[PDB]
Ligand binder design. Structure first.
Ligand SMILES: CCCSc1nc2[nH]ncc2c(=O)[nH]1
Length: 336
């Protein structure tokens, strides 16, 4: 029933009171030490050890103490509340990368610490740091044999998450190193797709510099066509400017974008809806001629039919109501 002392040892580690930890651990047999330092504590919905919690909270001195003076295994795993969620299989190192405590990361890998050890979702400490964009920690792990190519349970790579979260700094580092831009995920998405849907313009230029392939989403959508739907005009124009997309791919990208400008109540701008929907119409009719098969007018979208000719489109250039409808219809055709 001596686990009462273990709760004081845990509390000392959690709070970073290194001298309190020191006092508690002295005067104790080796049998006692392994017990108190290896006690899995269920405080909260979690499960962790003194070393892990010190790491999770960036208590370097407490962490430096347990390693150099009590030879505590760094392979200890646990379950830890982070940004809302509770992550299972985390080591002191992984927790310290997610929480962004560089100096504790240094301590842990300096001693024995598997930089490639994965959580239950298969997240390396590198992925953690990549999610949060601490370039200092990302650089250090990579330089100590962290594997850039281990991806999570769903093939989400370190580069993909850095692109999604918009860590331009981290993205460029991974590309200069080992990182494969052309990797796909369980849903078909690549680093480019993510960095397109979220409109991280700088990152898209970086991925272009590294000859990343334009491939199709699990939805059959090129990163260009994903930026259209996410109504990311800047990104769409960028991809269109480097790429040599067949007139159809171009037209469908311009339409999907323009259409996305009328409904997207966050970036809603019906006059840009005209700019792109009209531009795609000219591209249709430059001739040698890409005509479009519209859908019959349903009550849901008034009872309008989608403009077939360029002349039909100019007829609503100033009727913001009919253009707001037109966007809903074009997109209804292309996606839904
Ligand atoms: C909030 C700081 C990072 S928490 C986190 N969540 C994840 N989900 N899938 C992988 C990972 C990872 O490496 N870290």
């Amino acid at each position: 029933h001596m686990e009462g002392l273990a709760g004081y040892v845990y509390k000392a580690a959690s709070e970073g009171k290194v001298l309190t930890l020191a006092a508690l651990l002295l005067n104790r047999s080796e049998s006692d030490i392994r017990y108190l330092l290896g006690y899995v504590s269920q405080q909260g919905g979690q499960r962790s050890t003194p070393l892990i919690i010190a790491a999770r909270n960036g208590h370097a001195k407490v962490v430096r103490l347990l390693l150099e003076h009590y030879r505590v295994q760094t392979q200890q795993t646990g379950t830890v509340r982070f940004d809302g969620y509770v992550i299972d299989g985390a080591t002191a190192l992984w927790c310290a990368a997610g929480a962004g405590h560089f100096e504790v990361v240094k301590l842990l890998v300096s001693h024995g610490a598997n930089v490639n050890h994965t959580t239950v979702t298969n997240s390396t400490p590198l992925r953690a740091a990549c999610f949060d964009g601490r370039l200092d920690i990302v650089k250090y792990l990579v330089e100590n044999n962290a594997n850039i190519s281990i991806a999570n349970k769903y093939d989400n790579t370190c580069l993909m998450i850095a692109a999604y979260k918009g860590h331009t700094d981290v993205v460029r580092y991974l590309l200069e190193q080992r990182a494969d831009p052309n990797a796909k995920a369980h849903c078909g998405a690549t680093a480019l797709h993510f960095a397109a849907e979220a409109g991280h313009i700088d990152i898209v230029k970086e991925l272009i510099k590294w000859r990343a392939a334009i491939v199709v989403n699990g939805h059959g959508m090129t990163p260009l066509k994903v930026a259209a739907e996410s109504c990311k005009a800047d990104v769409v124009e960028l991809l269109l400017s480097h790429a040599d997309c067949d007139r159809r791919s171009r037209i469908e990208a311009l339409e999907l974008l323009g259409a996305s400008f009328a409904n997207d109540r966050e970036n809603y701008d019906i006059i840009k809806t005209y700019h792109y929907l009209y531009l795609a119409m000219l591209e249709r009719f430059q001739d040698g001629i890409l005509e479009k098969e519209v859908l019959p007018p349903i009550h849901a979208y008034g009872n309008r039919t989608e403009c077939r000719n360029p002349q039909e489109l100019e007829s609503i250039r100033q009727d913001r109501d009919a253009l707001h409808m037109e966007g809903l219809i074009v997109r209804e055709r292309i996606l839904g």
